[PDB]
Amino acid sequence: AQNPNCNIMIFHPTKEEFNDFDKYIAYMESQGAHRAGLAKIIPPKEWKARETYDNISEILIATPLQQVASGRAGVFTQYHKKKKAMTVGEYRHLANSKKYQTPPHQNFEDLERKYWKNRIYNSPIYGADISGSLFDENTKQWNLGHLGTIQDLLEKECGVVIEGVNTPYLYFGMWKTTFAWHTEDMDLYSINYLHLGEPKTWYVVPPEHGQRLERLARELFPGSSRGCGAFLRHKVALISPTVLKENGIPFNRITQEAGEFMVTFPYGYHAGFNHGFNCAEAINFATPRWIDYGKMASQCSCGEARVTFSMDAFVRILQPERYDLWKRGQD
Ligand SMILES: O=C(O)CNC(=O)C(=O)O
Ligand SMILES: [Mg+2]
Ligand code: NI
Ligand SMILES: [Zn+2]
């Protein structure tokens, strides 16, 4: 078995290997990458997402979210308070302000220590989940707006034609902005490209150990667990690496820099934080190997998780028994 310790693997494709996206994902899995839950792909030196980032300031962040924490430093939840709209240029200025800017630090490890020590005492503002793309239309390789759609994959694999669309989302981050422990909707893959700015640190649990994380989470968030049998679908809970180590949960960590792709694999729980002002783009995707994960994916039916239009068909076709209850949660 390749990669039996479930380490995060880093790949350096040539320009020739960068042509066929599906084929390269399948190559990475042949070397065991998926066992980690997360892989890093460094594009060939010849490649670029677009020519410059000089003209992005007038993109609108219609609903910036202030991420307010509750709990203790290593075990907390966050809720998202809606703020007034602002442009990317306004947001970048805010991120760089004395109130919100990255503190002085020695290296990424020192910054990670400071994040876990101090995150809960601040409420950073995140521009998340903004439909759109920063890839130039002329970028033909690994353009996250031109991937094969999940609906087309399901149709190719299973023969059923379904409604729905699949488009990318932009994320504008600042110091301490945080992504809570989660897997993707319907335990899909994700791909994330860091277009610009400061790094993003990731933590990930191997798919084969995801239920260990879930059991810890039920212990650590016992009221949330009673409220919903899939409450990590709410995307609000944080657990530090120190706490995961204390409880014997297998995980790994890596820092993504500007110009790098990350791929999350089906049922790979992940969480993380931004180091300073940055912009990422991400999208879900599927492969043939995903189908079995989609069929087994947990679902939130309590009403909190509320998701896209396009998840309807996935639940309806892959999880018909669950469909009725899940849809009640959506309505
Ligand atoms: O970058 C972020 O805030 C969150 N991204 C992801 O969870 C992802 O790409 O799967
Ligand atoms: Mg603009
Ligand atoms: Ni994710
Ligand atoms: Zn729920």
Short mmCIF file of C-alpha atoms and ligand atoms in Angstrom, two decimals:
data_model
loop_
_atom_site.label_atom_id
_atom_site.label_comp_id
_atom_site.label_asym_id
_atom_site.label_seq_id
_atom_site.Cartn_x
_atom_site.Cartn_y
_atom_site.Cartn_z
CA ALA A 1 0.00 0.00 0.00
CA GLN A 2 1.46 3.37 -1.00
CA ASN A 3 1.90 6.08 1.70
CA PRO A 4 0.88 3.92 4.64
CA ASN A 5 1.74 6.55 7.26
CA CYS A 6 -0.74 8.97 5.45
CA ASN A 7 1.78 11.79 5.06
CA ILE A 8 0.90 14.89 3.07
CA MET A 9 2.61 14.57 -0.31
CA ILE A 10 3.93 17.40 -2.44
CA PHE A 11 3.94 17.19 -6.22
CA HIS A 12 5.89 19.09 -8.86
CA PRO A 13 4.24 18.28 -12.27
CA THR A 14 5.97 19.27 -15.49
CA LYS A 15 4.14 21.45 -18.00
CA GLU A 16 3.36 18.30 -19.97
CA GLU A 17 1.92 16.54 -16.93
CA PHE A 18 -0.14 19.70 -16.14
CA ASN A 19 -2.30 19.25 -19.24
CA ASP A 20 -4.67 16.54 -18.18
CA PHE A 21 -6.18 17.34 -14.77
CA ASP A 22 -8.06 14.05 -14.25
CA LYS A 23 -5.04 12.01 -15.24
CA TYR A 24 -2.76 13.84 -12.74
CA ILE A 25 -5.27 13.39 -9.86
CA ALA A 26 -5.34 9.68 -10.67
CA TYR A 27 -1.46 9.65 -10.72
CA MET A 28 -1.30 11.28 -7.30
CA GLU A 29 -3.70 8.66 -5.88
CA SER A 30 -1.53 5.86 -7.48
CA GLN A 31 1.24 7.13 -5.20
CA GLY A 32 -1.00 7.19 -2.14
CA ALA A 33 -1.63 10.91 -1.86
CA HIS A 34 -5.26 10.54 -0.86
CA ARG A 35 -4.37 8.63 2.25
CA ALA A 36 -3.29 11.93 3.90
CA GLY A 37 -6.58 13.70 3.06
CA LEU A 38 -4.62 16.65 1.57
CA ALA A 39 -1.88 17.09 -1.07
CA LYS A 40 0.10 20.14 -2.32
CA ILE A 41 0.71 20.70 -6.08
CA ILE A 42 3.40 23.25 -7.10
CA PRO A 43 2.63 24.31 -10.72
CA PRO A 44 5.36 24.17 -13.38
CA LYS A 45 7.45 27.32 -13.52
CA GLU A 46 6.06 28.15 -17.02
CA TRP A 47 2.47 28.35 -15.72
CA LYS A 48 0.53 31.34 -14.47
CA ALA A 49 -3.08 31.84 -13.31
CA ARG A 50 -3.29 35.28 -14.80
CA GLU A 51 -0.89 38.10 -15.84
CA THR A 52 -1.27 40.39 -12.75
CA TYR A 53 -3.39 41.01 -9.66
CA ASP A 54 -3.20 44.80 -10.07
CA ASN A 55 -6.82 45.34 -10.99
CA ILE A 56 -8.83 43.34 -8.34
CA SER A 57 -9.68 46.10 -5.86
CA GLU A 58 -13.13 46.76 -7.09
CA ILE A 59 -14.45 43.23 -6.53
CA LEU A 60 -17.24 43.45 -3.93
CA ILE A 61 -17.40 41.50 -0.72
CA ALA A 62 -21.17 41.84 -0.28
CA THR A 63 -21.36 40.18 3.18
CA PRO A 64 -18.01 40.17 5.06
CA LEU A 65 -18.16 37.83 8.05
CA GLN A 66 -16.71 38.68 11.50
CA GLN A 67 -15.64 35.41 13.09
CA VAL A 68 -16.48 35.60 16.79
CA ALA A 69 -15.08 32.81 19.03
CA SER A 70 -16.41 31.19 22.20
CA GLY A 71 -14.70 28.56 24.39
CA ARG A 72 -11.05 28.01 25.31
CA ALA A 73 -7.91 28.58 23.27
CA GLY A 74 -7.61 25.04 21.97
CA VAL A 75 -11.36 24.10 21.83
CA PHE A 76 -13.74 26.75 20.55
CA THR A 77 -16.58 27.51 18.21
CA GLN A 78 -17.02 30.48 15.96
CA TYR A 79 -20.08 32.29 14.70
CA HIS A 80 -20.24 34.54 11.72
CA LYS A 81 -21.55 38.05 12.24
CA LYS A 82 -22.58 39.79 9.00
CA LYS A 83 -20.92 43.17 8.32
CA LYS A 84 -21.59 45.88 5.77
CA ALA A 85 -20.38 45.39 2.20
CA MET A 86 -16.91 46.51 1.22
CA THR A 87 -14.64 46.33 -1.82
CA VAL A 88 -11.50 44.16 -1.95
CA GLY A 89 -9.48 47.41 -1.77
CA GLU A 90 -11.30 48.48 1.37
CA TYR A 91 -10.88 44.99 2.87
CA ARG A 92 -7.14 44.88 2.11
CA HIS A 93 -6.72 48.23 3.91
CA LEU A 94 -8.66 46.87 6.89
CA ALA A 95 -6.55 43.67 6.98
CA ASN A 96 -3.36 45.84 7.01
CA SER A 97 -4.65 48.10 9.86
CA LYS A 98 -3.03 48.03 13.25
CA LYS A 99 -6.13 46.30 14.73
CA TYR A 100 -6.04 43.37 12.28
CA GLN A 101 -2.51 43.02 10.81
CA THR A 102 -0.23 40.02 11.31
CA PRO A 103 2.10 40.53 14.36
CA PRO A 104 5.82 40.35 14.15
CA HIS A 105 7.02 36.76 14.09
CA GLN A 106 10.14 34.63 13.50
CA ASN A 107 8.88 31.98 11.16
CA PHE A 108 5.67 30.04 10.39
CA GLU A 109 6.03 27.93 13.53
CA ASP A 110 6.18 31.00 15.77
CA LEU A 111 3.10 32.43 13.99
CA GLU A 112 1.25 29.12 14.48
CA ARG A 113 2.02 29.29 18.23
CA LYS A 114 0.67 32.83 18.35
CA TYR A 115 -2.49 31.83 16.44
CA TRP A 116 -3.39 29.01 18.87
CA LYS A 117 -2.51 31.09 21.88
CA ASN A 118 -4.42 34.21 20.95
CA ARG A 119 -7.06 33.53 18.21
CA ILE A 120 -10.04 33.50 20.54
CA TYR A 121 -9.32 37.05 21.81
CA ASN A 122 -9.86 38.63 18.40
CA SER A 123 -12.65 38.67 15.80
CA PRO A 124 -11.09 38.82 12.29
CA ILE A 125 -13.26 39.57 9.24
CA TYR A 126 -13.35 37.00 6.31
CA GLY A 127 -14.69 37.54 2.76
CA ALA A 128 -15.91 34.04 2.04
CA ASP A 129 -17.76 32.08 -0.43
CA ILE A 130 -17.91 34.76 -3.13
CA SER A 131 -19.00 33.27 -6.46
CA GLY A 132 -16.42 34.09 -9.13
CA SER A 133 -12.94 33.37 -10.62
CA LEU A 134 -9.60 35.09 -10.91
CA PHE A 135 -8.22 32.65 -13.58
CA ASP A 136 -7.65 34.24 -16.97
CA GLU A 137 -9.90 32.68 -19.57
CA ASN A 138 -6.82 31.95 -21.62
CA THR A 139 -5.22 29.81 -18.85
CA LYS A 140 -5.91 26.32 -20.12
CA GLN A 141 -4.23 24.20 -17.42
CA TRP A 142 -5.73 23.80 -13.89
CA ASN A 143 -8.17 26.63 -14.45
CA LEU A 144 -10.68 26.14 -11.61
CA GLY A 145 -13.43 27.75 -13.67
CA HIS A 146 -13.00 25.13 -16.50
CA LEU A 147 -13.02 21.85 -14.71
CA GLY A 148 -15.38 18.98 -15.60
CA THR A 149 -18.55 19.33 -13.52
CA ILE A 150 -19.64 17.00 -10.74
CA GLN A 151 -23.01 16.59 -12.52
CA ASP A 152 -21.24 15.39 -15.64
CA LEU A 153 -19.09 12.99 -13.56
CA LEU A 154 -22.21 11.46 -11.94
CA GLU A 155 -23.77 11.13 -15.39
CA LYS A 156 -20.66 9.51 -16.86
CA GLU A 157 -20.35 7.05 -13.96
CA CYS A 158 -23.95 6.25 -13.15
CA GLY A 159 -25.89 7.26 -16.30
CA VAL A 160 -28.33 9.59 -14.58
CA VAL A 161 -28.66 13.15 -15.91
CA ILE A 162 -29.28 15.73 -13.17
CA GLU A 163 -29.84 19.47 -12.76
CA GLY A 164 -27.22 21.65 -11.08
CA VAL A 165 -24.12 23.64 -11.69
CA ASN A 166 -20.63 23.75 -10.16
CA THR A 167 -18.76 27.10 -10.00
CA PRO A 168 -15.76 28.41 -8.04
CA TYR A 169 -15.66 30.63 -5.01
CA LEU A 170 -13.24 33.35 -3.91
CA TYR A 171 -12.02 33.84 -0.35
CA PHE A 172 -10.39 37.06 0.84
CA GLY A 173 -8.63 36.46 4.22
CA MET A 174 -6.73 38.30 6.90
CA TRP A 175 -4.66 37.31 9.96
CA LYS A 176 -6.53 34.81 12.14
CA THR A 177 -9.34 34.18 9.70
CA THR A 178 -10.29 30.59 10.32
CA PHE A 179 -11.79 27.59 8.56
CA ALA A 180 -13.41 25.18 10.97
CA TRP A 181 -13.06 21.38 10.97
CA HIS A 182 -15.08 19.91 8.09
CA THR A 183 -15.22 17.60 5.11
CA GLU A 184 -16.71 18.83 1.85
CA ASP A 185 -20.39 18.69 0.94
CA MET A 186 -21.22 15.08 0.04
CA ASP A 187 -17.56 14.23 0.96
CA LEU A 188 -16.39 15.66 -2.39
CA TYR A 189 -12.85 16.63 -3.30
CA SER A 190 -11.84 20.24 -3.18
CA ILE A 191 -9.11 22.17 -4.92
CA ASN A 192 -7.81 25.47 -3.61
CA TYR A 193 -5.45 27.88 -5.34
CA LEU A 194 -3.78 30.64 -3.29
CA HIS A 195 -3.76 33.50 -5.83
CA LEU A 196 -1.96 36.09 -3.78
CA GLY A 197 -0.78 37.32 -0.46
CA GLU A 198 0.13 35.68 2.82
CA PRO A 199 0.08 31.93 3.52
CA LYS A 200 -2.67 29.59 4.71
CA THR A 201 -1.84 26.84 7.28
CA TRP A 202 -3.82 23.60 6.98
CA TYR A 203 -4.49 20.71 9.32
CA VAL A 204 -5.92 17.42 8.06
CA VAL A 205 -7.05 14.00 9.36
CA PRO A 206 -6.51 10.96 7.09
CA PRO A 207 -9.83 9.72 5.63
CA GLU A 208 -9.34 6.30 7.13
CA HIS A 209 -9.31 7.98 10.60
CA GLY A 210 -12.10 10.50 10.20
CA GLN A 211 -14.39 8.77 12.69
CA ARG A 212 -11.73 9.30 15.38
CA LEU A 213 -12.01 13.01 14.90
CA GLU A 214 -15.83 12.81 14.96
CA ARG A 215 -15.78 10.91 18.27
CA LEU A 216 -13.52 13.49 19.81
CA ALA A 217 -15.65 16.30 18.51
CA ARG A 218 -18.80 14.72 20.11
CA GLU A 219 -16.90 14.61 23.47
CA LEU A 220 -15.66 18.23 23.17
CA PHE A 221 -18.91 19.78 21.91
CA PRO A 222 -21.48 17.69 23.76
CA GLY A 223 -24.54 20.06 23.39
CA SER A 224 -23.86 20.43 19.66
CA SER A 225 -23.61 16.66 19.32
CA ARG A 226 -27.01 16.18 20.97
CA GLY A 227 -28.53 18.75 18.61
CA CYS A 228 -27.34 17.11 15.41
CA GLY A 229 -25.81 13.81 14.47
CA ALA A 230 -23.55 15.54 11.88
CA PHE A 231 -22.78 18.85 13.51
CA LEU A 232 -19.34 19.27 11.95
CA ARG A 233 -21.39 20.03 8.75
CA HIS A 234 -22.13 23.34 10.49
CA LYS A 235 -18.51 24.36 10.00
CA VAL A 236 -18.10 26.07 13.37
CA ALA A 237 -15.85 23.92 15.55
CA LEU A 238 -12.09 24.27 16.16
CA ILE A 239 -9.71 21.90 17.91
CA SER A 240 -5.98 22.73 18.19
CA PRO A 241 -3.09 20.50 17.28
CA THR A 242 -2.12 20.31 20.93
CA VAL A 243 -5.59 18.99 21.81
CA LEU A 244 -5.58 16.55 18.92
CA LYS A 245 -2.13 15.21 20.10
CA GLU A 246 -3.39 14.91 23.70
CA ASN A 247 -6.29 12.75 22.49
CA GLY A 248 -4.28 10.60 20.08
CA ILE A 249 -5.96 11.78 16.89
CA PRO A 250 -3.88 11.19 13.79
CA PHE A 251 -3.30 14.39 11.74
CA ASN A 252 -0.82 16.35 9.69
CA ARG A 253 -0.18 20.00 8.99
CA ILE A 254 1.28 22.04 6.07
CA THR A 255 1.54 25.69 5.01
CA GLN A 256 0.33 26.71 1.52
CA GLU A 257 2.00 29.76 -0.08
CA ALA A 258 0.87 32.00 -2.91
CA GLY A 259 1.02 30.22 -6.25
CA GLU A 260 0.36 26.76 -4.85
CA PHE A 261 -2.61 24.39 -5.14
CA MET A 262 -4.00 22.20 -2.41
CA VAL A 263 -6.29 19.23 -3.06
CA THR A 264 -8.52 17.81 -0.29
CA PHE A 265 -9.67 14.22 -0.78
CA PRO A 266 -13.04 12.60 -0.02
CA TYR A 267 -13.77 12.45 3.69
CA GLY A 268 -10.50 14.23 4.60
CA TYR A 269 -11.38 16.49 7.55
CA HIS A 270 -9.48 19.77 7.37
CA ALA A 271 -9.21 23.11 9.24
CA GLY A 272 -6.84 26.04 9.12
CA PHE A 273 -6.09 29.75 9.25
CA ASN A 274 -4.71 32.61 7.18
CA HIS A 275 -1.46 34.37 8.06
CA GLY A 276 -2.43 37.83 6.69
CA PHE A 277 -4.18 39.42 3.73
CA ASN A 278 -4.68 36.86 0.96
CA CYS A 279 -7.00 35.67 -1.82
CA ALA A 280 -7.81 32.03 -2.55
CA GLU A 281 -10.09 30.37 -5.06
CA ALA A 282 -11.66 26.94 -4.52
CA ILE A 283 -14.14 24.53 -6.05
CA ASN A 284 -15.48 21.05 -5.40
CA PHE A 285 -14.89 18.23 -7.87
CA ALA A 286 -15.49 14.53 -8.25
CA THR A 287 -13.73 11.47 -9.70
CA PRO A 288 -14.94 7.88 -10.13
CA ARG A 289 -13.46 6.99 -6.72
CA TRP A 290 -15.63 9.64 -5.03
CA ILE A 291 -18.95 7.91 -5.85
CA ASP A 292 -18.74 5.44 -2.95
CA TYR A 293 -17.94 8.28 -0.54
CA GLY A 294 -20.86 10.28 -1.74
CA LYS A 295 -23.16 7.41 -1.09
CA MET A 296 -21.95 7.11 2.55
CA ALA A 297 -21.62 10.82 3.41
CA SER A 298 -23.22 11.96 6.61
CA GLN A 299 -25.79 14.56 6.50
CA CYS A 300 -27.05 17.42 8.68
CA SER A 301 -30.89 17.40 8.77
CA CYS A 302 -31.28 19.82 11.80
CA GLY A 303 -31.50 22.86 9.61
CA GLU A 304 -28.20 24.50 10.44
CA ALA A 305 -26.01 23.39 7.53
CA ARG A 306 -28.09 24.88 4.63
CA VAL A 307 -26.29 24.36 1.29
CA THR A 308 -26.42 24.93 -2.46
CA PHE A 309 -29.14 24.05 -4.86
CA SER A 310 -26.90 21.48 -6.53
CA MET A 311 -26.55 19.20 -3.44
CA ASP A 312 -30.25 18.29 -3.84
CA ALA A 313 -29.65 16.01 -6.75
CA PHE A 314 -26.64 14.36 -5.16
CA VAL A 315 -28.69 13.39 -2.07
CA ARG A 316 -31.66 12.41 -4.19
CA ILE A 317 -29.73 10.04 -6.42
CA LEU A 318 -27.00 8.72 -4.13
CA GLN A 319 -28.95 8.72 -0.81
CA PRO A 320 -32.64 8.21 -1.63
CA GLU A 321 -33.46 6.84 1.85
CA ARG A 322 -32.07 10.02 3.46
CA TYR A 323 -33.58 12.39 0.91
CA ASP A 324 -36.94 13.21 2.59
CA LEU A 325 -35.42 13.97 6.02
CA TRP A 326 -32.48 15.94 4.57
CA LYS A 327 -34.84 18.03 2.40
CA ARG A 328 -37.00 18.86 5.48
CA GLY A 329 -33.76 20.31 6.95
CA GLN A 330 -33.26 22.39 3.80
CA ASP A 331 -36.90 23.82 3.97
O1 LIG B 1 -9.65 28.52 2.29
C1 LIG B 1 -10.62 28.42 3.10
O2 LIG B 1 -11.07 29.29 3.94
C2 LIG B 1 -11.41 27.14 3.13
N1 LIG B 1 -11.14 26.25 2.01
C3 LIG B 1 -11.46 24.96 2.05
O3 LIG B 1 -12.01 24.34 3.03
C4 LIG B 1 -11.21 24.13 0.83
O4 LIG B 1 -10.58 24.59 -0.14
O5 LIG B 1 -11.69 22.99 0.92
MG MG B 2 -11.60 45.14 -9.59
NI NI B 3 -12.88 22.60 2.58
ZN ZN B 4 -27.14 19.98 11.86
#
